[PDB]
């Protein structure tokens, strides 16, 4: 399995996906046909091996396969770890899925375009979302250096070295790439091998995991007799799951009784485990996993339990409707082309509460200095007291990050 989850953030079309192509060799598909004409839309996914050419010279020593005869000589590169990416989209309004994604990440790579005016609306928006959430392991990258002057990718490296200054990003190193022709990527591999280090996760902890996809393996027309189970798609964060463990999802499906609303936990067994294209018997944090189940795929078709969280069956997790956020605000709206000042929060207003991987909306009942209580629509399964959350508003038709904080229970 992959050891660690790395984001690829940045502005729209700056080539976040193309840089996941040049490292993994895997494309996100670019799909929905509408993504095949737009660009990446659902969260991409791709894995690879990072060895190291011990018997040669760095950074070109940093391989992708067990093959060192590429650089210096043969001595089959000692394998260091296997990894996995999560490619967020770059378009301004697909803010609500990149946040969602960011509940799973152990580190990131900021893909700035060398041929556009540096602080681009989303490049920043993402960055401060990073600084907010706690993803303190960043590596900036200057992407399209194959279509610019040799003066131009330096003068921008000024602009990056000056923005990256008053912000927390000390020596966050800026490795210029060319995701297109896969030149100077092995030096990006040396960055990610040094700076984005493999954290320790205590396995004895309560099994908890997030979900960001889930799919009907059933092709148009698999017969009933070999109807494989439904498939939940997401990343473990704390613990390790095993093949043939009893499980529950939360908040889980809601019933209908004449206009009423009522969510409830669903139970099932782990039918199968798989990482990449290879099936496993256990699963551990870092990486996005997938869990074959025995529940009706109608329940997990398009991506129905998106935002849900998986835990042990017979575990202790509150399914809140109403919640106490301790919070703070950005002084600006780093997101809009325009930097208009974030107003102070008004009661009886609509806001988009990102908690974990779930992207709920909710209404504000109380407003203190830094303690607000939010009634919701679709519940939230609050697995701990250390639930980072992110707070957006509708400024002008398109949803915008404005404050953050922690969930209190």
């Amino acid at each position: 399995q992959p050891e660690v989850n790395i984001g690829v953030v940045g502005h729209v079309d700056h080539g976040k996906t193309t840089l996941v192509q040049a490292i993994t060799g895997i494309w996100t598909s670019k799909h929905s046909e509408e993504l095949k004409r737009g660009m990446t839309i659902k969260l991409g996914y791709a894995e690879t091996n990072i060895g190291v050419c011990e018997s040669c010279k760095k950074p070109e020593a940093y391989v992708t396969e067990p093959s060192c005869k590429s650089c210096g000589s043969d001595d089959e590169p000692k394998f260091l770890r296997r990894i996995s990416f999560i490619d967020a989209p770059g378009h301004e309004v697909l803010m609500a899925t990149m946040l969602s994604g960011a509940a799973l990440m152990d580190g990131a790579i900021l893909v700035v375009a060398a041929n556009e005016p540096f602080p681009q609306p989303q490049t920043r928006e993402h960055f401060v979302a990073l600084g907010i959430i706690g993803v303190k392991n960043l590596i900036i990258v200057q992407n399209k250096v194959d279509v610019v002057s040799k003066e131009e990718a330096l003068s921008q490296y000024r602009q990056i070295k000056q923005f990256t200054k008053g912000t927390w990003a000390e020596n966050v190193p800026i490795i210029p790439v060319s995701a297109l022709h896969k030149i100077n990527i092995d030096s990006l591999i040396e960055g990610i091998e040094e700076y984005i280090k493999t954290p320790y996760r205590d396995l004895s902890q309560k099994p908890v995991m997030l979900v960001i996809r889930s799919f009907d393996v059933n092709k148009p027309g698999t017969q009933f007799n070999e109807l494989k189970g439904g498939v939940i798609g997401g990343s473990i964060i704390q613990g390790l799951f095993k093949v043939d463990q009893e499980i529950k999802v939360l908040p889980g499906l809601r019933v209908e009784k004449q206009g009423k609303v009522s969510y409830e936990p669903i139970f099932t067994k782990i039918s199968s485990i798989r990482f990449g294209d290879e099936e496993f018997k256990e699963a551990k944090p870092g990486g996005l996993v997938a869990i074959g189940t025995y529940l009706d795929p109608s329940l997990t078709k398009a991506d129905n339990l998106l935002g849900s969280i998986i835990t042990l069956a017979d575990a202790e997790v509150p399914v809140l409707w109403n919640i106490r956020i301790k919070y703070n605000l950005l002084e600006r709206v780093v997101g809009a082309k325009e930097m208009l000042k974030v107003d102070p929060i008004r009661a009886k207003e609509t806001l988009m509460l990102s908690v974990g991987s779930s992207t709920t909306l909710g209404i504000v009942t109380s407003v203190k200095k830094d303690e607000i209580e939010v009634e919701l629509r679709r519940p939230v399964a609050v697995w701990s007291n250390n639930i980072r959350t992110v707070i957006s508003r509708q400024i002008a038709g398109r949803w915008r990050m404005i404050g953050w904080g922690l969930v209190e229970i």
Partner: peptide, 22 residues
């Protein structure tokens, strides 16, 4: 008329009572 008003009053009540309930 009183049709009107009853449902207007009801909608006002609900919508507002929705805003109170929320």
């Amino acid at each position: 008329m009183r049709w009107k008003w009853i449902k207007k009053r009801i909608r006002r009540l609900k919508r507002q009572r929705k805003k109170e309930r929320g």
